Design a protein around this ligand. Structure first.
Ligand SMILES: *[C@@H]1O[C@H](CO)[C@@H](O[C@@H]2O[C@H](CO)[C@@H](O[C@@H]3O[C@H](CO[C@H]4O[C@H](CO)[C@@H](O)[C@H](O)[C@@H]4O)[C@@H](O)[C@H](O[C@H]4O[C@H](CO)[C@@H](O)[C@H](O)[C@@H]4O)[C@@H]3O)[C@H](O)[C@H]2NC(C)=O)[C@H](O)[C@H]1NC(C)=O
Ligand SMILES: *[C@@H]1O[C@H](CO)[C@@H](O[C@@H]2O[C@H](CO)[C@@H](O)[C@H](O)[C@H]2NC(C)=O)[C@H](O)[C@H]1NC(C)=O
Ligand SMILES: *[C@@H]1O[C@H](CO)[C@@H](O)[C@H](O)[C@H]1NC(C)=O
Ligand SMILES: CN1[C@@H]2[C@@H](C(=O)O)[C@@H](O)[C@H](O)[C@@H](O)[C@@H]21
Ligand SMILES: [Cl-]
Length: 605
């Protein structure tokens, strides 16, 4: 068993690296009017706390069931946007954007998209919505949003809404014109389905044909705007299978629809396995996290480094249910702790979520890298692979960086007995002030809250103490900053588990220390516990060791594992949580940034 050799050249910056994977999504349960519950508020706090904007978009189904109506077509029709405002504000509060599927019936009003009056009403609803949120958040903000068709139109998922082939095209034109009437800057794509071989997926292929050659319902004009094409293709447990399927569909689009040769393609349900709620042990831990990284690596290395692929979304923002808090396709593990007064909810950060924080350390340029075993060169379509990046500095709060993310993953298969010897030879590091490197490591032995849960006997309602034990496995194992050797080379010989993730971060020292933590808030969990959450928007550099939290009832530091996750659950052994909190960044050279404004918290008994 010859070791895997991973060579990286930090002088050879090859091309841009785009962070095309910063998306998640979910569907609310039946009936369609949850998204405003404390559970969801906590869930989106965890999603937005991934550092350095590591998750940006939350693709959310049934948004237009958050709109209700009064009156009627003949009486005079009014919309109540209150609940939609709530969800969108909640996203905004967490620095997230909706993947805005135009999906729903506005509480039973819309029934038939071949009914001429309804198609007109839809256009005006879409325009009203768009103008409303342009007013609420500014056009710059709303024009970042991916507006999209109704989810999976060929999967008959319409409630009491008749959506025939022709109805879908009318609906589309109403979406397209509605948005256009508000602003030409707004983006719309679709269909968000499989694109199986014809005669399958008629509404998906039909939409493309309509937009390429058909006639606009409202303007009679040939051709209709289509700013991106969204497909769904999942792996059936194979990672590389996702890409293979995407290439077939993308090639069929290129030849059949020449006007869409450059039209960006999204896979906004790019999951290892269909069926989020189906319990799978690999979904619980680093097996899934490493596979998600591998899928992304494959896409960067075997596709983008030429079809116009722009977005990949792991559809994993669902909330898990008893009796499978960890084993569902979710970023967090939900515990409904019913036996307190009152009942409360706790979430644990699962490794997949933690991995998104490692991916987020990748910067804007891809570096040359090569993996080989015994002299044979191995591309990312193998169990071990790599993604390496570099940062070009600008400011004095900034300096050169390299991030090298290595994965060991056999898709959904874990191999607890195996050890994979890896030699990382990093060469070409430009000279710079105070060059240091930091490792962060994840595997099922060291960083699996699921594993801790099972070691504790799978408590259905964990005690506070059991929760602390479980959370102690959330973060990666980090080695403190070490100076780089002289000469600009670094050679390391880690033993990786299968699965595992290792991020090697090499940073030059910026002239100035980190910026200020902002937007600190304290959220109640239960007597004796709260969540602290904040933004790293003005922190500057990614060369961060931890966030120092201080508490005052003189300010005292709160002792904890190092973490760059922009969220912390504070569950002191004493239950003493009333007082003031403040947080600051601590960088790799032990320099603090300035404290956040203090945030007071008074518990009510
Ligand atoms: C602590 O208190 C909480 C409530 O505050 C309880 O939470 C409920 O827990 C049960 C699980 O024990 C949940 O029931 C499950 O609901 C799932 C989703 O239901 C919705 O969505 C589906 C599909 O999208 C619809 O079909 C359905 O009508 C709902 O709208 C179901 O998918 C689950 O079904 C699976 O397992 C069951 C067997 O139990 C089978 O019947 C099914 O075939 C399927 O494979 C399941 O029914 C319930 O949703 C939770 N409620 C809430 C509000 O979240 C906790 O149970 C309680 N803790 C303890 C330990 O008692
Ligand atoms: C990824 O590697 C696999 C090999 O594991 C490739 O799939 C094989 O292709 C051969 C011939 O082309 C087929 O006979 C087999 O069905 C495949 N083998 C196995 C064991 O699955 C696949 O082509 C590679 N994919 C990419 C995108 O490079
Ligand atoms: C709109 O809906 C909200 C939430 O259901 C409700 O509280 C509010 O009063 C409604 N407004 C009107 C004008 O009906
Ligand atoms: C086909 N069904 C998948 C489903 C799942 O696999 O659970 C889930 O990701 C989405 O809510 C649906 O839009 C797609
Ligand atoms: Cl999956």
């Amino acid at each position: 068993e010859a070791p895997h050799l991973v060579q990286v050249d930090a002088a050879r910056a090859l091309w841009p690296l785009r962070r095309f994977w910063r998306s998640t999504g979910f569907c609310p349960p039946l009936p369609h009017s949850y998204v405003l519950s404390w559970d969801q508020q906590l869930n989106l706090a965890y999603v937005g706390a991934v550092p350095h904007r590591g998750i940006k978009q939350v693709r959310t189904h049934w948004l237009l069931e958050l709109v209700t109506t009064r009156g009627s077509t003949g009486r005079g029709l009014s919309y109540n946007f209150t609940h939609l405002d709530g969800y969108l504000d909640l996203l905004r509060e967490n620095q997230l954007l909706p993947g805005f599927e135009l999906m729903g019936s506005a509480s039973g009003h819309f029934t038939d998209f071949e009914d001429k009056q309804q198609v007109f009403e839809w256009k005006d609803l879409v325009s009203s919505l768009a103008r409303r949120y342009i007013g609420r958040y500014g056009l710059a903000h709303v024009s970042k949003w991916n507006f999209e068709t109704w989810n999976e139109p060929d999967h008959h998922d319409f409630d009491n809404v008749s959506m025939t082939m022709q109805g879908f095209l009318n609906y589309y034109d109403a979406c397209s014109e509605g948005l256009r009437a508000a602003s030409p800057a707004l983006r719309l794509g679709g269909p968000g389905d499989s694109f199986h071989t014809p005669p399958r997926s008629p509404l998906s292929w039909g939409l493309l044909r309509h937009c390429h050659d058909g006639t606009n319902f409202f303007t009679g004009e040939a051709g209709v705007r289509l700013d991106y094409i969204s497909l769904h293709r999942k792996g059936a447990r194979s990672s590389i299978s996702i890409l293979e399927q995407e290439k077939v569909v993308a090639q069929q689009i290129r030849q059949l629809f020449p006007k869409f040769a450059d039209t960006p393609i999204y896979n906004d349900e790019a999951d290892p396995l269909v069926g989020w709620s189906l319990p799978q042990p690999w979904r619980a831990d680093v097996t899934y996290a490493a596979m998600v990284v591998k899928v992304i690596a494959q896409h960067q290395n075997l596709l983008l480094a030429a079809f116009p692929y722009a977005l990949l979304s792991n559809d994993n923002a669902f909330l898990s249910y008893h009796p499978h808090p960890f084993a569902q396709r979710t970023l967090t593990a939900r515990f409904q702790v019913n036996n307190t007064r009152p009942p409360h909810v706790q979430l644990l950060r699962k490794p997949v979520l933690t991995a998104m924080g490692l991916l987020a350390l990748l910067d804007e340029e891809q570096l040359w890298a090569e993996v080989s075993q015994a002299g044979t060169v191995l591309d990312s379509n193998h169990t071990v692979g790599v993604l390496a990046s570099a940062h070009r500095p600008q400011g004095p709060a900034d300096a050169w960086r390299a991030a090298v993310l290595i994965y060991a993953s056999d898709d959904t298969r874990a191999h607890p007995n195996r050890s994979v010897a890896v030699t990382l030879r990093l060469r070409g590091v430009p000279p710079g002030p105070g060059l240091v490197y930091v490792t962060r490591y994840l595997d099922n032995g060291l960083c699996s809250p699921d594993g801790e849960w099972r070691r504790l006997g799978r408590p259905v309602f964990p005690t506070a103490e059991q929760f602390r034990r479980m959370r102690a496995a959330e973060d990666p194992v980090a080695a403190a900053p070490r100076p780089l050797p002289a000469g600009g080379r670094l050679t390391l010989r880690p033993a990786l588990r299968l699965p595992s993730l290792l991020l090697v971060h090499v940073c030059a020292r910026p002239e100035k220390p980190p910026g200020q933590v902002t937007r600190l808030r304290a959220l109640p969990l239960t007597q004796g516990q709260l969540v602290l959450v904040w933004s790293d928007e003005h922190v500057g550099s990614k060369c961060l060791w931890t966030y120092e939290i201080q508490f005052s009832q003189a300010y005292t530091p709160v002792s904890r594992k190092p973490s760059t996750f922009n969220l912390f659950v504070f569950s002191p052994d004493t239950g003493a949580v009333s007082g003031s909190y403040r947080v600051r960044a601590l960088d790799y050279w032990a320099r603090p940034g300035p404290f956040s404004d203090p945030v007071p918290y008074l518990e009510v008994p």
